[PDB]
Amino acid sequence: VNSFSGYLKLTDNVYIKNADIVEEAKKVKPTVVVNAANVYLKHGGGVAGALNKATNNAMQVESDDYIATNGPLKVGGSCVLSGHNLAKHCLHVVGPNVNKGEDIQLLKSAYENFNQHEVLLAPLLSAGIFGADPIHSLRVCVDTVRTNVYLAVFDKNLYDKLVSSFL
Ligand SMILES: O[C@H]1CC[C@H]2CCN(c3ncnc4[nH]ccc34)[C@H]21
Numbered sequence: 187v188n189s190f191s192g193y194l195k196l197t198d199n200v201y202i203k204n205a206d207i208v209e210e211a212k213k214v215k216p217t218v219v220v221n222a223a224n225v226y227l228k229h230g231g232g233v234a235g236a237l238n239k240a241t242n243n244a245m246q247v248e249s250d251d252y253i254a255t256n257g258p259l260k261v262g263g264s265c266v267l268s269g270h271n272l273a274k275h276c277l278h279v280v281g282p283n284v285n286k287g288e289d290i291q292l293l294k295s296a297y298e299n300f301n302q303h304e305v306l307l308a309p310l311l312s313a314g315i316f317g318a319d320p321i322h323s324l325r326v327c328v329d330t331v332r333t334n335v336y337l338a339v340f341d342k343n344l345y346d347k348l349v350s351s352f353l
Contacts, residue, residue, distance in 0.1 A: 188305065189214050190336045194349060199334050200327060204345035207233055207309050207338040208240045211272040216336075219269055220300070220308035221245075222316070223278035225258040227265075233309045241270040249278070261288050262295030277303060281312035281323075290318060297330040305334045313344070324348050 190210075193201035203210070211219045222233040227249035229238035238245040248267055259265060264279040281296040282288035296311050311327070312318035327335065339345040 190307075193336055196324075196352060197328055199332060200337065201335070202324075202337040202339060202345070202348065204340070204342050205338045206236070206340045207307065208236050208272070210307055210336070210338045211237075211269075212240070214307065215273060216269075216305065216307040217274045218277050218303045218306045219273035219275075220306055220311075221276050221278045222309050222311060222314070223259070223264075223280050224283070225261060225263075225280055227253055227259070227278060232314045237272065237276070240272060244268075244270050245276065262292040264296075264299035273307070277306065279311060281316055282318065283315075284312070284317035285315070290322075293318060293323060293326050294330050297327050300331045300335055301333050303333055305336075307336050307338060310337060310339055310344075310348075313339075320344055320348060321351050324352065 193203045195201055221237055229235055229246050259280050261280050261282055264277055267276050269276045279296050279299050282292040293312050300306055310323050312323050313320045
């Protein structure tokens with residue numbers, strides 16, 4: 187039993203809700219919140235900008251030190267950093283950016299990172315400015331993640347569309 191509330195069960199292990207991931211994190215304080223990151227951990231907009239803003243830029247400061255030490259992430263890769271005031275940990279996951287020409291097959295690799303964590307609060311990867319088809323991303327999530335994932339989709343119209351189209 188956990189403290190997530192109001193989610194639609196999609197499968198044994200995948201849940202979805204029309205909500206701002208930042209507000210879900212503030213409410214639940216999950217062990218792991220997933221950030222929809224880029225390879226440079228530059229948290230400019232979307233989920234990343236919103237999470238970072240909610241940490242008063244502490245996420246960005248930590249991320250800049252990470253990159254200075256380790257270099258960029260791979261597309262499809264991830265790193266575990268602090269969750270600051272929002273969660274115990276933040277799993278920064280890089281989905282492919284189809285507008286950069288990046289291989290959509292890497293979306294499956296991106297979701298595989300979730301399997302290293304028993305429970306996660308997460309956004310829909312490669313949605314928004316990364317340009318992937320959100321229905322496909324949800325299908326990849328359900329077909330790839332085996333651990334318990336609570337998906338927060340802030341855009342109401344998108345949430346409604348994903349729920350009615352799921353195959
Ligand atoms: O709405 C979905 C569909 C478009 C994506 C880009 C932003 N986003 C978010 N998802 C969840 N929480 C969020 N907080 C702030 C943004 C945000 C996604």
